[PDB]
């Protein structure tokens, strides 16, 4: 608390906090310089790919979607997310990408600017057969987390088997000639490949049972894939508790 001296304070910080924001920014901007505008410096963390699903999880979903077949409003929440993802793989959207078949990895070259947008493989929603959506016995959609320059697999395709032992359910898979087709990899990155589409795998649980919580875990297997669950339950697997309480 002074007087006719506050000007000696205000002006001080003005060009001291000034100098400091100026240095702080100074050091962010140098750091930023030393990173590739197409690939992060560390991939470890991300390394085991996560498996995520469309149905917004109330808790541990992907199908921890408890709803009532008898009620229209009950499913509507899950449908919004379901439509949101699928909307992306519309045919209108894909004009210019390239058509493929289930096969081996395709190498666009190095992660370099000298080539134009790397052409991604087309993916038709049509491949996901039979899947508003399933009013009863939901048809959840699975996806593998994108990771640049990662080649998951061996053989033609990386499998996804969902399992409960464990009470009855009937598993049905819709996956574009397979499971996850290898022709989709490696992923060049958003910079290199803009409207890139990752392979989806629809799963339908036609299960005869009703009114009970079924813990259904869908797992992906590969040399590359590893699982935790002692931590991230997401790591290469799903945790969904479907309940068709009708």
């Amino acid at each position: 608390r002074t007087l006719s001296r506050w000007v000696w304070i205000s002006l001080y910080y003005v060009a001291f906090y000034v100098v400091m924001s100026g240095i702080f920014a100074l050091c962010i901007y140098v750091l930023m310089r030393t990173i590739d505008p197409y690939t992060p410096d560390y991939q470890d963390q991300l390394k085991s790919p996560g498996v995520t699903l469309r149905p917004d999880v109330y808790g541990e979903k992907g199908l921890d979607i408890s709803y009532n077949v008898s009620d229209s409003t009950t499913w509507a929440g899950l449908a919004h997310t379901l439509h949101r993802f699928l909307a992306g793989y519309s045919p209108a959207a894909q004009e210019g990408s390239i058509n493929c078949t289930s096969e081996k990895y395709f190498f666009q070259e190095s992660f370099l600017a000298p080539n134009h947008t790397k052409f991604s493989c087309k993916f038709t929603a049509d491949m996901l057969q039979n899947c508003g959506f399933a009013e009863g016995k939901p048809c959840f959609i699975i996806k593998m987390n994108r990771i640049v320059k990662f080649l998951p697999g061996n053989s033609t395709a990386p499998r996804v088997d969902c399992a409960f032992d464990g009470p009855p359910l009937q598993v049905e898979y819709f996956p574009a000639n397979g499971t996850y087709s290898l022709h989709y990899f490696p992923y060049y990155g958003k910079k290199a490949q803009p409207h890139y589409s990752n392979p989806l795998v629809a799963a339908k649980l036609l299960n005869v049972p009703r009114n009970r919580d079924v813990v259904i875990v869908c797992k992906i297997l590969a040399e590359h894939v590893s699982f935790d669950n002692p931590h991230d339950p997401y790591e290469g697997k799903v945790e969904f508790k479907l309940k068709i309480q009708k």
Binding site: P40, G50, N145, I147, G189, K190, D232, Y234, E235
Partner: peptide, 10 residues
């Protein structure tokens, strides 16, 4: 920024 997807725990 890359376009990679991360789980919650990761």
């Amino acid at each position: 920024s890359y376009g990679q997807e991360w789980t919650f725990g990761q």
